[PDB]
Symmetry: C3
Subunit: 334 residues, 3 copies
């Protein structure tokens, strides 16, 4: 059974095929690839774009999305094995995935880390459990990685430069400020796809404490060696932005401070200057800027940057619809 | 770009065309006017009829509605310009409207005032912001006016009297009791459409403190002068109801007490006799009664009035479906 | 007007016809029985399977389900007659049912008891009120009985034994532990359908305090006398399980302790051994086991029992989809 948990699990040929189908769907949006089929969108956290794009995607392909929010409308789920379920959880994922598998053709899952302990969050328990027990394909709608965002992002870049081959371009993945520590998911994903695409990637962040989990630094390394691009970690803003072709911003809390954010708060506040403004963007090679959204203006990026013709954030957001339809079409087959 | 923010922005010919299309949809409910199209229903407040009628309307015309509730499932939105988004809001309407505009063909918005300060609530910031940033038509699902209710109401009246021309009929818009101060939206709308339709309108309320915002009193005046009807404010129940052809009730808090309801509470409680009962209705010319719903029985209207053959509230509620389908059909064109 | 409030209101012929149509829908899932039609799914409590199965059912038959949650997205409803609505409730069921009746073709309702006083909960006020005021068929999605579960359960049993005639089989409806007192709905329903099907039923529970409401004990008696099966109450585990063909577990709070659960808590805790394990199941005649779900593993049933080839819980859960489509098809006719 083939799932869409991470682009890293797919071959370059398969990913290129997904991106091409995405481009095709963008030209002809209505289809019958999901005629009479259905997808269960399981959200453990908030969403606007994700719920909307998947729901519309299913509709445009003749299918139907059922939106579920455990703990909200659906019942809370247990993932640990062998435990005595006498707590808050009402049913086990083993039953949840099997039942849904009798109803729907696809299951999408969004579940952010709990932020109590990265040791457990990095295990991707919810996602892996769905994939394990589900008799139908599972799609990652964002957990500790955000593969759908990777392809929406990649497609937007290919559309911007007018070519699928992004090798040679200087890609800057920069950390940005936010009054709170966030998931590293989008950052992990950006690093993964930018390298897989063979670009010269620079992970710009304040201190070594903000470097991403080794798992992804390693995927990136393997990606570079096989793509022809390069990987580099930087802590100097100006040297990073210099001659960049793409600037992708994202904020996240330092992994070393998981479950103990009290002390990291004063640490992030000292770098609220990492904000992407006209000044920094002026250092790039007429580079494009984007963010996965939602974005806090004048905090992560300035109004001027967000409104510049170089900002492709809206295009990337739109592409979520097309890339997800490509993913759902690829996973079904009945 | 044409939106449906208020009936006052539309010409009488356009409104008559909407009402006629509504009547046509009521005769033939299934159609293809929205085939493959979609509408994003953004609810900032509660709804049963509105969400249901729009959702079914989209379905019956071959389209699909995506229901969104910011702060609930979607992310909280910022509307003020240039501010440093370091508060509760996660993203700006500029991004929200632009992204939705890449997904859907129409955007409906429901956002009640905050009731903290009428000076800001009367600016209709949420609605206006959607219309400003959205690349697709925006529909008012109730903010400080309720235009969809106006047309549902108007159609019901035309169906009751068996004619589109309501000129000559005596229309009584009466305030009614409610343990809490409410939005003036429906009242503002009732006054607007009743005058636009050329009826002899009487705004019956307890004291001059319950008179509606000048904006609407003025729209009404302009409407009367151009329709041939009349406008009058009254504080005497019996003189108002006398010879009335239509009685539309609605409760609302005194604008002069916005943000300071503590003292107005004892004021409204002294007029809990404004309730629409058989006695008052017996003073009318075999007049019809209606309320926009939801209605608290034995508080706003008595069980006897609600169950009388003269009450057309259920018909008006039904018409919300037909009028909204007419509105969505008029706004799309692709 | 025909509703689906309880299987007990239907003749055996009608129920057999429903089960047969369910079997037919399971073979050919897509149809046009609900083409252009719609159902309003009103949930006063949580749901995953129910909302999903009904929503998908409507979709597969060419219709559309509108999901509503009063107090959540829709407005809170009043059911008592003649009262002065100056409390929390915003509108009366009389208006709610009539309005929905102008929009949809079917109305499903899920409303659990309040657990404050069984005298009032057993009156089934919400369900009965919808049926009373609705101009369209009403479907019980679980209140104090769970008829849709009965048919899903019955069909699964018929599929297991390869025959619609379950007469002769030994059926054991056993109480099971749960850290909290639950609704007796599923138990009441299991007892009702097992007897209606003519099986030899044994109501196994800890003490006479856990015996179900007389209403259902009596339905069961009437059912046995007319079906050829039998009814028996037991408090001894081993004697009950012995030679059983079917074991259906469900936990519920003692009716005599409604509104006063403080003292029953220590009572249930003394019987946490009623858990369905391999030991008890080994006492049966190669019997099948099932639960309505959601189920707390190692509390209501052991992991070994839930994973045994004899557990048909997933099949029963799947059947909810097919039986409900049969029910909706039977109730519509336009
Ligand atoms: C602010 C916050 O928690 N953001 C989330 C992402 C929101 C979803 N975005 C998307 N494009 O799908 C984060 O990962 O930090
Ligand atoms: C009680 C309350 O807040 N009511 C709202 C209206 C509810 C929506 N009605 C409708 N018909 O769309 C009010 O404007 O006072
Ligand atoms: C735990 C709890 O409250 N359960 C509910 C039932 C949940 C719905 N199940 C179903 N199969 O439709 C009960 O009746 O006890």
């Amino acid at each position: 059974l083939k799932h869409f948990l991470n682009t890293q699990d797919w071959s370059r040929a398969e990913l290129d095929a997904l991106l091409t189908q995405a481009a095709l769907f963008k030209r002809n949006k209505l289809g019958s690839e999901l005629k009479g089929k259905s997808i269960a969108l399981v959200f453990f956290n908030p969403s606007m774009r994700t719920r909307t794009s998947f729901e519309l995607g299913a509709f445009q392909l003749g299918g139907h999305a059922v939106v579920l929010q455990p703990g909200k409308d659906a019942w809370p789920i247990e993932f640990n094995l062998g435990t005595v379920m006498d707590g808050d959880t009402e049913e086990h994922i083993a039953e949840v995935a099997r039942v849904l598998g009798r109803y729907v053709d696809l299951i999408g899952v969004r579940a952010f880390p709990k932020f109590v302990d990265w040791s457990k969050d990095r295990e991707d328990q919810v996602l892996k459990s769905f994939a394990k027990y589900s008799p139908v394909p599972v799609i990652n709608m964002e957990t500790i990685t955000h593969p759908c965002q990777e392809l929406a992002h990649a497609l937007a870049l290919q559309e911007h430069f007018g070519t699928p081959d992004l090798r040679g371009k200087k890609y800057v993945l920069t950390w940005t400020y936010h009054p709170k520590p966030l998931n590293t998911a989008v950052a992990n994903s950006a690093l993964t796809i930018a390298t897989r695409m063979g670009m010269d990637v620079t992970l710009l962040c304040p201190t070594p404490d903000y470097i991403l989990d080794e798992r992804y630094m390693d995927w990136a390394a393997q990606n570079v060696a096989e793509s022809g691009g390069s990987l580099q970690v930087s802590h100097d803003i100006d040297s990073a932005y210099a001659g960049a072709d793409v600037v992708y911003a994202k904020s996240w809390g330092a992994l070393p401070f998981f479950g103990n954010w009290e002390p990291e708060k004063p640490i992030r506040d000292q770098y609220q200057h990492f904000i992407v403004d006209e000044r920094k963007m002026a250092l790039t090679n007429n580079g494009v800027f984007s963010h996965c959204l939602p974005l806090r203006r004048n905090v992560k990026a300035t109004d001027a940057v967000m409104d510049s013709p170089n900002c492709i954030a809206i295009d990337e957001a739109e592409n979520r619809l097309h890339v997800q339809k490509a993913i759902m079409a690829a996973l079904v087959g009945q």
